[PDB]
Protein-tyrosine phosphatase, non-receptor type 1
Amino acid sequence: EMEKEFEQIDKSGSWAAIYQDIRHEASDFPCRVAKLPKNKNRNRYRDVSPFDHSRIKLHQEDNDYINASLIKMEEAQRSYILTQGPLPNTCGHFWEMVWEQKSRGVVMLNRVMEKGSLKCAQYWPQKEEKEMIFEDTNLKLTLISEDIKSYYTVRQLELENLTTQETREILHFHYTTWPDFGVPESPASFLNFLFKVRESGSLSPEHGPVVVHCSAGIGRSGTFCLADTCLLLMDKRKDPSSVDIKKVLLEMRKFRMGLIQTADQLRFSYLAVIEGAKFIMGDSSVQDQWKELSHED
Ligand SMILES: [Mg+2]
Ligand SMILES: [Mg+2]
């Protein structure tokens, strides 16, 4: 069981060993499209690229490249799109992807302004009366409403394809207090956030894959999806103790590199899954318990 596994790993102080083993066994696939000279300004980081086999392709003739990967978890029956924080020149591409992939939600785990440097562009409207128009992709984005909490904000946006004038409601879940290469304040606050995303219906199979991003789209976003997928698996299998989080992470790493960037993020993932299991195994009391422990605004 992960409960006992966590315990032994924690007692012996071997998180660095398990994490390094994961990095060592992680899949290696080519990223030739991402490294093409013409795509240099579409990547935020030189060392973070999507594999060619799982990258999301924009439905356009000019250039179909966007630093985004489709994570398809077969057993868990859920897919996620992990991408970098949009750049000033890829904001239109980002929303084009959301439209073409039919996503209902966008999960943001970073802040536009991190440790001084801008790890992400302001790709959504901050005011209702100031909508955004992405000329290159012919899309319009309007802020409909926003619910601000102490450590996260939920926004309701309207995305319109200016070509067909059809519109769609997109839910934006922004976790505002998760540092780069850091962890959430507590398993409770993280789980409260995750379950808010689940309850919104954004992760339903009737919609396209949820779009999850942070700065590079691998550390924080990897942690988020790993925890969700593991909880999903525990709920499906006849044996909830059969879930090997290390194995699930490696499966996820077949679709995008570097998911989960620190030994501590790995440790936290265990904690989130362990605590979350309490809700999955009945006892729907923990649900409201996390809400209280997270001290929302
Ligand atoms: Mg106002
Ligand atoms: Mg309002």
Summary: The two ends are 36 Å apart (CA to CA). The chain has one domain: 1-297. The pocket of magnesium ion (ligand 2) is lined by residues 145 (CB under 6 Å). Residues 150 and 296 are 5 Å apart (CA to CA).
